[PDB]
Amino acid sequence: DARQRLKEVEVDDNGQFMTTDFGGNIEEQFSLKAGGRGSTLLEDFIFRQKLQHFDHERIPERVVHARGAGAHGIFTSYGDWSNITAASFLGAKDKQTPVFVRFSTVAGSRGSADTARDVHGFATRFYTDEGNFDIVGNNIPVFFIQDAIRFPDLIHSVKPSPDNEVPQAATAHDSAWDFFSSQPSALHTLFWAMSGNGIPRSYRHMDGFGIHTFRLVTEDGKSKLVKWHWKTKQGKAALVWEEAQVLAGKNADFHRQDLWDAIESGNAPSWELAVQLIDEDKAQAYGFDLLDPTKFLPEEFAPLQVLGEMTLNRNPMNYFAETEQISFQPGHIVRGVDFTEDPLLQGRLYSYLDTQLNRHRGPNFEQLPINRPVSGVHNNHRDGQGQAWIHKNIHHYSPSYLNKGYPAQANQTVGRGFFTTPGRTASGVLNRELSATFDDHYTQPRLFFNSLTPVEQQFVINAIRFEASHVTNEQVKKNVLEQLNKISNDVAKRVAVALGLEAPQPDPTYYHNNVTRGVSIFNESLPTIATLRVGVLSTTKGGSLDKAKALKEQLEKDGLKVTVIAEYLASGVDQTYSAADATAFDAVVVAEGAERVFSGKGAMSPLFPAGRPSQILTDGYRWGKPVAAVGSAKKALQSIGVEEKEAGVYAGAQDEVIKGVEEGLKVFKFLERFAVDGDDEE
Amino acid sequence: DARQRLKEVEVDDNGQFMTTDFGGNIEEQFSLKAGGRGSTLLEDFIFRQKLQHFDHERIPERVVHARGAGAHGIFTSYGDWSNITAASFLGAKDKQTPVFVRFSTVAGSRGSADTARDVHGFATRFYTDEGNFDIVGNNIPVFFIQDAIRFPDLIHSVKPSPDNEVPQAATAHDSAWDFFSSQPSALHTLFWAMSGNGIPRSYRHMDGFGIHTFRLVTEDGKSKLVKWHWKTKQGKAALVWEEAQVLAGKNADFHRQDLWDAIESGNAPSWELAVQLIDEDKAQAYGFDLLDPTKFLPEEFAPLQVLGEMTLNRNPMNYFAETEQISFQPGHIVRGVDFTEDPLLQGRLYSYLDTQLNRHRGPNFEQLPINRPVSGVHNNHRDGQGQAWIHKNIHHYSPSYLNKGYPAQANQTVGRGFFTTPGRTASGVLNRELSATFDDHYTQPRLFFNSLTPVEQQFVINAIRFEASHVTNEQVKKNVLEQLNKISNDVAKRVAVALGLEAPQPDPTYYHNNVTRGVSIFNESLPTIATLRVGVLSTTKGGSLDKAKALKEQLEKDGLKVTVIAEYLASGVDQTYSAADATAFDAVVVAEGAERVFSGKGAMSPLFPAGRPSQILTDGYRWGKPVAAVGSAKKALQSIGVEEKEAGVYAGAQDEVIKGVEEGLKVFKFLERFAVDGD
Amino acid sequence: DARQRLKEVEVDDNGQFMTTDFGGNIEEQFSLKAGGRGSTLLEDFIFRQKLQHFDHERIPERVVHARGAGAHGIFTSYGDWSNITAASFLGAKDKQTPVFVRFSTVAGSRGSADTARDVHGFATRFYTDEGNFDIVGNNIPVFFIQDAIRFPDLIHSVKPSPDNEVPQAATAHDSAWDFFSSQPSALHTLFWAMSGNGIPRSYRHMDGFGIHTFRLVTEDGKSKLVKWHWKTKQGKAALVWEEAQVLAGKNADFHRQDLWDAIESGNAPSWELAVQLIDEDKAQAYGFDLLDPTKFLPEEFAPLQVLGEMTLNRNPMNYFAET
């Protein structure tokens, strides 16, 4: 149990009487009043201590990544990696370290939709025996900007306009695209956010990236440059934008429920921890500066080397005390790892320490149960708001004769202390510049786009088309066009069509045809269909429900989560048509006999909105999901104009439908149903 | 061990390596720099996590009673008091409850002197098995004001002037005496603060009071009116003002050191808890309203009934985490006790809960180790800054089928719940007024002044003369005299002399000659002299130090703390003359042969300020202490014009001096040395 | 008037009726009660709004230098110093700039005595036309330690023992002299603190120092190493320790009252701003490293150059809001 250390602070209220926060049993359902219908007394200490705690429940949301969810788990190392790092948690085969991971979006506030289009956070804490080590990552390997001092500008431009606070959780407005086109470094991450990475199917279907080049350091002090990767064992998978939008309204907790259900049902998700390793003397040897956070390292140049695997198997007990209160920091570093001169990472180190003082209203936030290490804290820090400990050492200073030198200094050779990479040097003038090696803002965006499938490329273009069409200012849109044209003339011309702007002329300085692996989502089927959702649309009339039950039981044998849907909650029905939507499922199957609710009287009922079963089937097909119908229910396929032998469409008896649906869930999205530019011309 | 429950939060750094606040061994004595003589790097996470915690160490001090100190201990009940209270901590003979007590001044800020003249706080927390019960009291049984809405007015007027923040920890300025005379209710507590209660010898030599009338409630709801009293087993003792002034500069920590040393040396101080009990129908029977916090109940009408004893025997381990962080509340009430309609108490219940939000910057301050009860907390409160627990009940609301009714409601008949006194009634118009029964502001100040000894009365008069002479405004000084003349014409006349104002003619409306017991300090000797301090003035020349060591060993047999003083720290010397002052001791005795440092070359040395041994003896004599000299050292007493004929002065051989000094310490202060108006 | 810009936030209550913090005239000398001898009602918004502000009056004292006092004034440049610095406030003869100065102790808390033996702060703000420039200095030209990461160790050692919080505003205890003897860099400032600098007669009778070497830079990038000096026009003066001990008890506000009285009586104190100017290539040429804050540069090697004069002529109107 990864939460084992947290059980000492867990409070069980069952079987007990109500109390105040300072003890004493009470009743707290009536205010103390001066007379039968009199005014409430100031001396009602019970009322005041109850309402004051309610009044003070909220803490500030995170300044970025305010919307997200998390879970506990275990990380297991696959070997003794002392040959590359002194990091304790990687020092032996099958060594296990408790983790907590929080996934998130970036721009939206606390109550915004999971399926907004956005970069996604992927923050992992290792509770190692030599301190907490945090990898505060994203599901995209490059970031918008090259210097941390520009972070407020980026975030202000993509967060709501400061006059009306419109729009929520979205880059589709003037200020954001004004910034993307005025700061061309941002276009690489923008392309990633405009792809499937911006609308993933779940937290469990994302890769993770530390983005920055870090350093692994051995006991003798030798170092190597390193990139952190998390590779999902569930496979990468993404939605389509028109589906993500409906899902934002139908279930804004789609992603956090996904992770919770997967863990509750015993299908804990896993990611493998992998690294790219680079010699120090090759930091600038691959066509870009490895200090540049707007660049990723093509796997053709440095392949991923798996070090271990992380499994998230325990949900939190109290979301606020654990998920909301946890405080990640890239400054949470340990012996065996070091920073680099990445100007974006450099400022992060200051920013995450500082912002905790705003979120937690004091300096003792590492004493919170979810932030505490398991390795012990011994120093001369004292006092501060909410000090939860009572220190014994009264000589709280160093050096000291009176405390005998304890707590004692630890460094590279004594006490396994942290040490900066010994060979690191500084050379040159103090400057407020960026290295000229950071100047190329277009080559890698072109590289990313080249490496996507044709329909995947169309998704990127259609996302940009959707986003840029919200920009009111004409010049901003033309500025966007000029910047896009430096990535690819074809992308600019296809985006320009939606904008009503003239197709720009080629500017080939950065054009190229190179491609790289690992970057696509839709060119690979899932390695497993466990936890994937199947909506079975049935009816309470006739014998349809009995068949849906058998259809459900066999589908569950393969590890799928099946929801039987009908007019009302008859025996065996999991959900009503009124409460059902196609966004909640990865495949839709119409049970035999349920074709009655797709036409005629059966489709017009007071118990669900008009056309709901037809709409669920239409949404699922148009959003590329595997859809099916058993036996006579093929008439439902007919009523929305879907043909039986289309790709990802399955009609027949129960068993062939079951096999066809499960095969289609591996494909996940059938991209034959999405038009590409040039298809419609006569 | 009263601190037993605090064991699990203690952190031991012995033999450990230095770490960050998130773990990981580090060194933290060098900043990370870019080159040999280079600038510090932002990426030095070690530096910023160490300095950030230092930068954020301070929390706001208490809005009042900022200066103070405390200790842990045990309360033991003397009996089963269920016939008067349902309170669990008083429900069985020999039942023990851990306590923590904080003593304080009122006006001064965190770093002000202990021996400022002020009302003194005396706050006790009982960690009962049915919740935390606080009696947030003072060492004076009455308060300045009758309605809690006036507390900011009182406190602003006493605290430093808002333009220059002058003066520190003192009532001796214009605005305070402008309030005292404009708000005549304040005259009673003023007289108490102008008495020995304003300059107590130590926290251990104070009585304590809850001030307010509260209610004790039995199981069936029948209530009694109650006054809380703490009776010190050490006896009450006070300084004189001219002595307390010097001590404020020589040792501003005089009182917190005295409490620490008493516990550290195994001389734990003790207080008996006593109550005055009054039937509900006698609330207005004794010449005043018991809802009025500017009056006390004379013990002739209701004797003190002792219910148990409290002993403070454990010092804190970290001052800030324990003493500074503890959050007292009169609203911390338990089953068997209830409030009364005292308009001062009523507002306190609001203001102590509210002020913790400022001092602790969050709603979860009761989760701090020093504030946690021992009895268990089960409710549906959640979240808040610094939430330190993880609740299991996901149905955090009532009523509810899903949580099966838990946590469940508790009331008078089920669950041992708190319950307001069943018979209390409201009646009349909603009003912003005070009862006319509150209108006498002069009788009880007169009663208090009557019940003190003549020199004790003179101390009060000389306190007033000192204080009011600091008031620059002439009309305020006349306003003060006009109000003092309402209490006693003789008091006003004697104060008027110092102010150069005319003796006002008698205003006899509230004059009376009644006296009451239990309010005097100087009319009673001390029950014990254990822990009292003796400074032995000696010299490294000759054989004086040998005799001082013998003198010390015999005095220590009586539980006295003895400091041998000489020019330098020779073998057997506890303190140099340079560091010594008479304010630190309760008796001064000159060892034989030490008269050499009282005149001539022995008095002129680079090792101490000129005349310092003579100043200590002069100070000790003039401040009413027992002073003595052994053998030839009587020349030192003659050198300052003091003769052995006098009370509190002892000479002769060693055993003669020891028995005399130990006798004199019981009297403590010799009031023969203080002149009285027209004596 | 140095305080001229603060007039528009000044609030006059003479002749007015009592109000709440959200307006509306009120009375606030009686709690609202349910009957003649009744309990106070929660609906008394007047009471709660008045006590909530009182309950929330205090803010944390400064982690160091908590005990001090201040005043407003004017700094006037003696010349056009553009040949050594581009600083606007030194860019013309007779140019005037508003200032505020806070003097302080170091160790003691908010209510500690002014005549404790201690290092003393001398913090000066110039409200220049190109931003606020602060010289946050002390009355002693050298500091205890050579690296800022050791500051919590120094301060923990000098401030009271964490078990009983004894002693107040004093280095005369075990932990302080443990650190002084274990960290020998501290002995320079120690010796200064043991001299008259530790018990000055008043704030007006102190010199001031920036301690650190800084840089003055011209418009074209030319730099010189600089040490800041404040030279009191009233003369340096100190007490004796047996006197300062009694004064700590007789008047804890001795220094803040002395500064207040001098300004209010028309006797405004003044200091001249003076600098030592060192070439960059001589940073290590005078028997020590000029980056080392435990060393001062003897004036025989570099005499002072007077840049201007500052005079403190305006007391604050509200201590809390200003000082």
Ligand code: HEM
């Ligand atoms: C490669 C670049 C970056 C990555 C991968 C990244 C990732 C993240 C993630 C995953 C979180 C949420 C952690 C959680 O779930 O609690 C977060 C929060 C945050 N980030 Fe970043 N971020 C990056 C850039 C930056 C920069 C450049 C800054 C500022 C200079 C910054 C400042 C913050 C702050 C202040 C928070 C809030 C943390 C808190 O309130 O606890 N981020 N970031």
Ligand code: HEM
């Ligand atoms: C009989 C009248 C009073 C007595 C005996 C009394 C006593 C005390 C004592 C002993 C303390 C110090 C607690 C400690 O040691 O931590 C204290 C603090 C305090 N008192 Fe009073 N007081 C009285 C009246 C009032 C009134 C009328 C108010 C406001 C309406 C008030 C507001 C406060 C506040 C806000 C604190 C600070 C509490 C904290 O920050 O923990 N007091 N009082």
Ligand code: HEM
């Ligand atoms: C040459 C060395 C130093 C000098 C001349 C100096 C001077 C001062 C002065 C005069 C003040 C009070 C200003 C006021 O009246 O508000 C002050 C406060 C302070 N000092 Fe220093 N100090 C020195 C060393 C340090 C170091 C090394 C640190 C930390 C690394 C530090 C941290 C602080 C802090 C946190 C405050 C509180 C300021 C506030 O609360 O606004 N000091 N110092």
Ligand SMILES: [O]
């Ligand atoms: O971030």
Ligand SMILES: [O]
């Ligand atoms: O108080």
Ligand SMILES: [O]
């Ligand atoms: O400082």
